Design a protein around this ligand. Structure first.
Ligand SMILES: CCCOc1cncc2nnc(-c3cnn(C)c3-c3ccc(CC)cc3)n12
Ligand SMILES: [Mg+2]
Ligand SMILES: [Zn+2]
Length: 340
């Protein structure tokens, strides 16, 4: 159903977003409930709704071909796959719809954000940055002096897609705007390195304290940074079932890297060591120390974003609640102590 795929994608209309689901454009929509078969069409619906296609006279063949090439540029580790990218892109669309980004950022910045969302984890292998370095990967070999190893590769892969014949959805920009767009993507993608976020966190607080100034150029940069990290973590803004299930995949991925490190004779981080990792406290810590501050910062800049923070805080309480279930009380389901 692969070339079947390009053809349908291109020669039918692009569905109106509302026809996808009546709640497609609300903060309570879970993008991962859309069949993976429909997600490319969905990307195009959002692009058309956000008016970028008919704004920039983008080649529908080029655009549909971009989309499928982006999708195909993901591997299939448990977490860092296309459905991640898709729901991350979808949240960006939500932000643009519910928060009115056009009053905050230039059309080009928003386009670069959405597109960086599609591409921000391309060709991920289920290993992190410290793995690249520790294992002397060829990615660590090329990007050897400044960290953000994977993020540098994700941007590199996005670049190589745009430079594939019939995939340059930017080949309509002036050379000036083309450069600007590439520098935008690099910055937004790079911002998805958690180390980056921790570096600029103080500056984000400040901007939120004094208030976003649209004539401040450094505010534009910080906003786009905060918005992108809000997109990368948006699974935490949905239901309990979503955080629960996203913990499954995360930990499945992490533990595989740990098993591999052990085999190479490295010592894995605890959260990657399936023998040592206590998932409930790892989640609460992650929630309390990473994701919560992101959505609080977003609530401070954007008062309509408040429901998202309160979702994320409610998801944390719930890990607190079910946290006792990770000590086996009574007997296992089968009434057996064999597992001993
Ligand atoms: C930090 C390690 C904990 O990992 C996670 C644990 N629970 C949920 C989760 N959702 N995404 C992550 C995660 C996995 N790897 N990375 C790099 C992230 C992550 C983290 C932050 C950002 C904003 C800067 C972007 C991505 N998660
Ligand atoms: Mg990433
Ligand atoms: Zn990501």
């Amino acid at each position: 159903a692969m070339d079947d795929e390009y053809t349908k994608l291109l020669h039918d209309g692009i569905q109106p977003v509302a026809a996808i689901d009546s709640n497609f454009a609300s903060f309570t929509y879970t993008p991962r409930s859309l069949p993976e078969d429909d997600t490319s069409m969905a990307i195009l619906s959002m692009l058309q709704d956000m008016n970028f296609i008919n704004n920039y006279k983008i080649d529908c063949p080029t655009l549909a071909r971009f989309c499928l090439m982006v999708k195909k540029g993901y591997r299939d580790p448990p977490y860092h796959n296309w459905m991640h990218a898709f729901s991350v892109s979808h949240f960006c669309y939500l932000l643009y719809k519910n928060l009115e980004l056009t009053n905050y950022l230039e059309d080009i910045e928003i386009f670069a954000l959405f597109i960086s969302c599609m591409c921000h984890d391309l060709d991920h292998r289920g290993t992190n940055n410290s793995f690249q370095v520790a294992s002397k990967s060829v990615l660590a070999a090329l990007y050897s002096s400044e960290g953000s190893v994977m993020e540098r590769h994700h941007f590199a892969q996005a670049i190589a897609i745009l430079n594939t014949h019939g995939c340059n959805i930017f080949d309509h920009f002036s050379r000036k705007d083309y450069q600007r767009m590439l520098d935008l993507m690099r910055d937004i993608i790079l911002a998805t390195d958690l180390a980056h976020h921790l570096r600029i966190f103080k500056d984000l607080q400040k901007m939120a304290e004094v208030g976003y100034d649209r004539n401040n150029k450094q505010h534009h940069r910080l906003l786009l940074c905060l918005l992108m990290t809000s997109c990368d973590l948006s699974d935490q803004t949905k239901g309990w079932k979503t955080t629960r299930k996203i913990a499954e995949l995360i930990y499945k991925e992490f533990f595989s890297q740990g098993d591999l490190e052990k085999a190479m004779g490295n010592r894995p981080m605890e959260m990657m060591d399936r023998e040592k990792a206590y998932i409930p406290e790892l989640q609460i810590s992650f929630m309390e120390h990473i994701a919560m501050p992101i959505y609080k910062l977003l609530q401070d800049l954007f008062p309509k974003a408040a429901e998202l923070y309160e979702r994320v805080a409610s998801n944390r309480e719930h890990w607190t609640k079910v946290s006792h279930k990770f000590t086996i009380r009574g007997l296992p389901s089968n009434n057996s102590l064999d597992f001993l």
